A paper describes a structure:
Here, a high-throughput approach to determine room-temperature damage-free structures with excellent sample and time efficiency is demonstrated, allowing complexes to be characterized rapidly and without prohibitive sample requirements. We have applied this approach to crystals of two heme peroxidase enzymes: a multifunctional dehaloperoxidase from the marine annelid Amphitrite ornata and a dye-decolourizing peroxidase of industrial relevance from Streptomyces lividans (DtpAa). We also examine the challenging case of detecting nitrite binding to copper nitrite reductase from [name], where the ligand displaces a water molecule bound in the active site. Our results cover several different ligand-binding scenarios, such as coordinate-bond formation to a heme iron (imidazole) or copper (nitrite) and noncoordinate ligand binding in a pocket (DHP ligands), with the latter being highly relevant to the binding of ligands to pharmacologically important proteins such as cytochromes P450.
Importantly, we used AcNiR–nitrite as a very challenging case to test the limitations of our approach as the nitrite ligand contains only three atoms and also displaces a water molecule upon binding. In addition, the water density in the native structure is disordered, with the presence of a second water molecule a possibility. Notably, refinement of AcNiR data and subsets versus the native AcNiR SFX structure produced clear positive difference map features for the nitrite atoms that are separated from the water molecule present in the native structure. Coot successfully located nitrite binding at the type 2 Cu active site in subsets of very few crystals, with 200 being the lowest number of crystals that were needed to successfully auto-find the nitrite ligand. Although Coot was unsuccessful at determining the ligand in the lowest crystal subset of only 100 crystals, positive electron density is still identifiable at the site where ligand binding is expected, although this did not allow for reasonable modelling of a ligand. For AcNiR, with cubic symmetry, the data remained essentially complete in all of the subset sizes analysed, with density for the nitrite ligand remaining apparent down to <200 indexed images. In AcNiR structures determined from single crystals, distinguishing between the electron-density features of active-site waters and nitrite is challenging and requires high-resolution data.
Author numbering:
A (entry chain A), B (entry chain A), C (entry chain A): 8 to 340
Write the structure that this text describes.
């Protein structure tokens, strides 16, 4: 009887950060209430000023990470304000039935809906918009995010022993297909609807023009680098709603990796690089052992360094010369 | 001594259906006899009437699924009628030696051959045509299928316990590279040989024009949807002879997944999406828990909804409001 | 205290061969000393005479395979002779900190450096050049290789039992992006620097012009086929620093496969084809059971047979008619 379960409302936070939560569940099953507002908005995605009409959950690309525990009920209030122009909905890969909820959550501008589903399988899952007849357009305009369903007793390693993270970050990776003129310059449009016919032709080339973390080239660099300290245990959740990616921590590893993101499976150990298939969320666990700057990249290095799929970690702490040292610094022969 | 083993002839059925078989072997090892006839034929692959010269095993794209048990002998009679125009052969990824049998089964039009091999490894495997110097042309013209080698005691879960399916379907996914004129219209040809020079240039772009299930856009939709009922256990075998795919059941999961298709390995649990590498067959096991329409897609959603890699399941039964319910139906604010 | 550990200098050998080593460690941890010399050189990569300016470690594409054991120290002396024209460095995916060593090993022409790192995780790992601002250019010009970190007690199967190989081969797979004129002919350049601006535009198409084993179309065919005998146990190490690949032994299998290359994980059994993500090294173990010619391919068959990713094994021994036999040789009906 759901009417008698505890309820908690959770306010979401913008990626790459994650709303507060417990790793090991301290309560029994609950109804966890979320609210998301759809926002169509102009987004500048690179240094040259290329702009697109993004379709977002809660104003960000990716949408925010939701965190619940196995056999909680997720109750999502989805709002499509009348300032938007398109029909939207939501499909949870975590949910069972009605096309992940997409068949029940179709909202025109000016409408809202509330969906409830039981989170019966633990793991990280993609959620995304999927309206009849324009599914890839909405997904590749940034309308996707992820939900994490933790086991009620938290994460465990390949031997059943507890894994506790000190920090969690959510990296949503987005392939964009910006239409081009004949010389190769990017086009701009006044409304999403104006872009639609060109967007379909741009998608059919299967060649992204940009592949970005957190909605823009360089979004997770500089002042916006992810932070940690030597000795801290970090969980990196990574989603790609449409296209394969192969994350890699330059200078580190994935100590424990759920490449396809499902926690009833044992993790893969000591990964240098792992494949997250398009339409999947994965998670990697790493304990930092050296300070300094790390890059976190899609290890198709063209996609990383030419098309935008690269971010930074800045890690504080003491350098360990046993793990690595420069014996002879670069010098002339 | 093979001369003293029992023999059974099996008549194949057209995909997505699968010929009758036992999951748990009731006999000892047998010689299982199959006959396949090669057919080159014109195929209409989309709604706009695009036609190609398909090269098929037994008249279908994909070729039919063969089912045997571990350490059976597969005896294939391969017939190339004199109405065809090209040399053909067959390479079983399930077989050991002679390029999977391709070096022993080269038949010109008007010829036949009989190959026997021992099915020493359990799993689902690709088979495909592979003639010297024109391997990708034949494969990407649809000349590929799959063979399933069940363990003699049937499928088992990650804990060694029996898994029994009530229904099995075979989805063969095909990337096509149809040559285009300079405006982007598809070309048509009178014979396969006329197409050859353009086909090689179309393949070298590495960009498919169509990606389809069961040989055509929409082949597994509408009246041809796959069917099941709530409570039924379904095994979906999926093959891709040439290109990576990432299947996903919209509204469901892969409860047990052998993404690279080899049954001596434990399955991956609770997958939302899984990667089947080009040149591989995989299998997913799911128990339907909600009725309604499901879509089964390659979760590069451009490949699914723009290029053709999408099919339907229609599932009967009672809706379970505990798993999912619309609390507030879409309404105006 | 490193000053008191034994030291051994190892001279590297050209791929596909591997320098002599012990599978089970016979000594305690050691400092293993390697020397590599960078060589920028013109390379002919196909039958039509297409030439590129390769950037190599030790004069080969890929760079040589280094073999050490877990918790050895790797001490690399890296030399950039003054006959080269570009800055180079090295990033070991096996190493922890300083961008895998890339931040510590930047050498201009005429400089050298010596890096030491502890090999704390067993597996096969990529190493590659990665200079600030031109990472994919150097990697896709061939400046990548692999290092194998064996467990001190050797390789083990999925049940913990010893796996011993008789032969080991290293196949480095390289995607090249050769710039083209408007008719599609490949361009040639006098120096690497002349090529740079066109190379970036060629890479951004994400479409390789060539995909080769051991630096050239046909490099591992003919007289340069890999060799083995029936009954021999062969380990094939395969790396791809930039792009996914899906290796397949035509006529064989991967009996034990570490597709993402990390030996603390149990191997996948009986693979027909396996996915090595871009930026990863994998390893497959196979016992040959039939003599004859085998092809070893990337099983995107367009990439294999049109773009160059195919090599040969020639295996001696006695044919086993129990595994495969031609019952009726190809004959006219
Ligand atoms: O080592 N990451 O390119
Ligand atoms: O949720 N399948 O797009
Ligand atoms: O069976 N390898 O194409
Ligand atoms: Cu939408
Ligand atoms: Cu989806
Ligand atoms: Cu054929
Ligand atoms: Cu094959
Ligand atoms: Cu370099
Ligand atoms: Cu790297």
């Amino acid at each position: 009887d759901i009417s008698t379960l505890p309820r908690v409302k959770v306010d979401l936070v913008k990626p790459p950060f994650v709303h507060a939560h417990d790793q090991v569940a301290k309560t029994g099953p609950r109804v966890v209430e979320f609210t998301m507002t759809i926002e169509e908005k102009k987004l500048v995605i690179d240094r040259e000023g290329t702009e697109i009409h993004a379709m977002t959950f809660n104003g960000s690309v990716p949408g925010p990470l939701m965190v619940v525990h196995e056999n909680d009920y997720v109750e999502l209030r989805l709002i499509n304000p009348d300032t938007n122009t398109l029909l939207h909905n939501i499909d949870f890969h975590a949910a069972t039935g009605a096309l992940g909820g997409g068949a029940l959550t179709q909202v025109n501008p000016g409408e809202e809906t509330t969906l409830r589903f039981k989170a019966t399988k633990p793991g990280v899952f993609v959620y995304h918009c999927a309206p009849e007849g324009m599914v890839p357009w909405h997904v590749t305009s940034g309308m996707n995010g992820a939900i994490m369903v933790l086991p009620r007793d938290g994460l465990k390693d390949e031997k059943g022993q507890p894994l506790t993270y000190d920090k969690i970050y959510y990296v949503g990776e987005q392939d964009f297909y910006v239409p081009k003129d004949e010389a190769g310059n990017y086009k701009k449009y006044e409304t999403p609807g104006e872009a639609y016919e060109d967007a379909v032709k741009a998608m059919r080339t299967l060649t992204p023009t940009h592949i970005v973390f957190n909605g823009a080239v360089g979004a997770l660099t500089g002042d916006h680098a992810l932070t940690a300290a030597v000795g801290e245990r970090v969980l990196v959740v990574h989603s790609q709603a449409n296209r394969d990616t192969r994350p890699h921590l330059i200078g580190g590893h994935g100590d424990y990796v759920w490449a396809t993101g499902k926690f009833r499976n044992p993790p893969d150990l000591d990964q240098e690089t792992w494949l997250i298939p398009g339409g999947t969320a994965g998670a990697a666990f790493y304990t930092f052992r050296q300070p300094g700057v790390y890059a976190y990249v899609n290890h198709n290095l063209i996609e990383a360094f030419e098309l935008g799929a690269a971010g930074h970690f800045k890690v504080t702490g003491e350098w360990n010369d046993d793990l690595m040292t420069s014996v002879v610094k670069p010098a002339s022969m």
